[PDB]
Design a protein around this ligand. Structure first.
Ligand SMILES: Cc1cc2nc3c(=O)[nH]c(=O)nc-3n(C[C@H](O)[C@H](O)[C@H](O)COP(=O)(O)O)c2cc1C
Ligand SMILES: Cc1cc2nc3c(=O)[nH]c(=O)nc-3n(C[C@H](O)[C@H](O)[C@H](O)COP(=O)(O)O)c2cc1C
Ligand SMILES: Cc1ncc(COP(=O)(O)O)c(C=O)c1O
Ligand SMILES: Cc1ncc(COP(=O)(O)O)c(C=O)c1O
Ligand SMILES: Cc1ncc(COP(=O)(O)O)c(C=O)c1O
Ligand SMILES: Cc1ncc(COP(=O)(O)O)c(C=O)c1O
Lengths: 199, 199
């Protein structure tokens, strides 16, 4: 029926949870996939998709290789943007915030909590660096695949994650004649200020 | 079967055209939808989806309201990033370049080349500005819908477009064990330098 201000929950995460739930329900591919935009030292933005793994009032979490380009960029400029490309459901969610590193305890908890082959793969790829051949990846995977073979894959020191704070959350939902519904939740004084934005 | 360097075309657009074609062929929702990231004066990146409307060696084109936030941001920092979220087909394409304004001739040509109701809608929405109620949009739409009623909708002076140059184009294609194929085409000396990147 549309998106009216009077139906908006006070906490934007309530609305986000609802939309995420419906995305899963609709079997959209990678419902947790979001595009993370970061900015390099020259003011050049860069983008790549990562998976949302957890969220709460403190922010949205994703894991990545600490030697990657996104990691280097975040270290020089912590300001990031997240966008959930749910246009198949005529929706978009955009989050603006600062990326902060997760602690070792959190990373360990998640790391050992995933496909064994994925843990090994984390060791293999020096994410974002130029490599001369795909073969390097496959060779290392096999080599490590049996080096760790009898125990449990160790957490690589170069693997970690970030939590993006919720400074702003924007919801977009398709609208007739190109007049879409847009609401911007803006964190202010321990509260959320809501404004409709022209499409 | 995978993505090997030996099968890469010299011109990245050849590969892009192929992937775009297959995306349409697969009936993915909004095959031309791409996430455009821009950066504000504080170094804060922002994102939103727009539709690719044309592309060639000079770059990728999209249209938008010239009073919008993305437009203001581009005017302060022309460096943008484009990402085609084709993860349903285990693919991503990322473009890095500078956004340049399109001329009036180009904009007029495209503008009058689209749904009449969309032309009218372009007049209605002061894109990105805070509005107090959805009603403002609907009222104006009706008002203009009959003001232009007998002729052809005029091109709003505040409507335009941008062409993003091709400085870098990155292709990503899903790979077993989390070891994906990544190739970065980098424009150099009137030519393209190709490097595989660790996933
Ligand atoms: C559906 C999907 C999910 C992904 N999830 C992650 C993730 O959670 N963490 C990660 O580091 N890379 C992930 N990637 C790979 C990234 O898009 C990117 O290639 C990689 O992180 C390197 O980006 P960077 O060079 O900008 O640092 C994913 C790709 C797709 C298509
Ligand atoms: C599938 C899809 C296609 C869209 N295409 C465009 C477009 O071509 N031009 C445009 O201005 N906005 C488009 N939008 C709306 C934008 O995402 C965004 O709301 C708007 O441009 C304002 O962004 P801004 O406030 O950052 O300037 C589209 C949204 C979706 C979901
Ligand atoms: C898998 C992997 N990731 C990341 C890194 C390294 O980060 P850095 O760029 O400091 O070498 C390495 C480094 O040797 C590595 O093997
Ligand atoms: C605000 C806006 N402008 C333009 C477009 C698409 O371009 P066009 O209407 O010229 O096909 C969209 C598509 O969703 C849009 O939301
Ligand atoms: C539909 C629309 N778009 C854009 C603009 C304006 O751009 P500006 O922020 O300079 O007022 C207007 C301004 O009155 C408008 O009506
Ligand atoms: C490089 C990389 N790391 C992590 C993930 C997903 O997180 P996880 O493997 O812990 O489920 C992906 C998913 O595509 C990925 O490509």
């Amino acid at each position: 029926g549309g998106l009216r201000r009077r139906d908006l929950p006070a906490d934007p995460l309530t609305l986000f949870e609802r939309w995420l739930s419906q995305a899963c329900e609709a079997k959209l591919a990678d419902p947790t996939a979001m595009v993370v935009a970061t900015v390099d030292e020259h003011g050049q933005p860069y983008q790549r998709i990562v998976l949302l793994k957890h969220y709460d009032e403190k922010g949205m979490v994703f894991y990545t290789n600490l030697g990657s380009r996104k990691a280097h960029q975040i270290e020089n400029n912590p300001r990031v943007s997240l966008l959930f490309p749910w246009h198949t459901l005529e929706r978009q969610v955009m989050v603006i915030g600062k990326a902060e590193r997760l602690s070792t305890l959190e990373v360990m908890k998640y790391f050992h909590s995933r496909p064994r082959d994925s843990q090994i793969g984390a060791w293999v790829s020096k994410q974002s660096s130029r490599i001369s051949a795909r073969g390097i990846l496959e060779s290392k995977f096999l080599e490590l695949k049996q080096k760790f073979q009898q125990g449990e894959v160790p957490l690589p020191s170069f693997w970690g994650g970030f939590r993006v704070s919720l400074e702003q959350i924007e919801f977009w939902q398709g609208g007739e004649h190109r007049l879409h519904d847009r609401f911007l939740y803006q964190r202010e004084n321990d509260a959320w200020k809501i404004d409709r934005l022209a499409p």
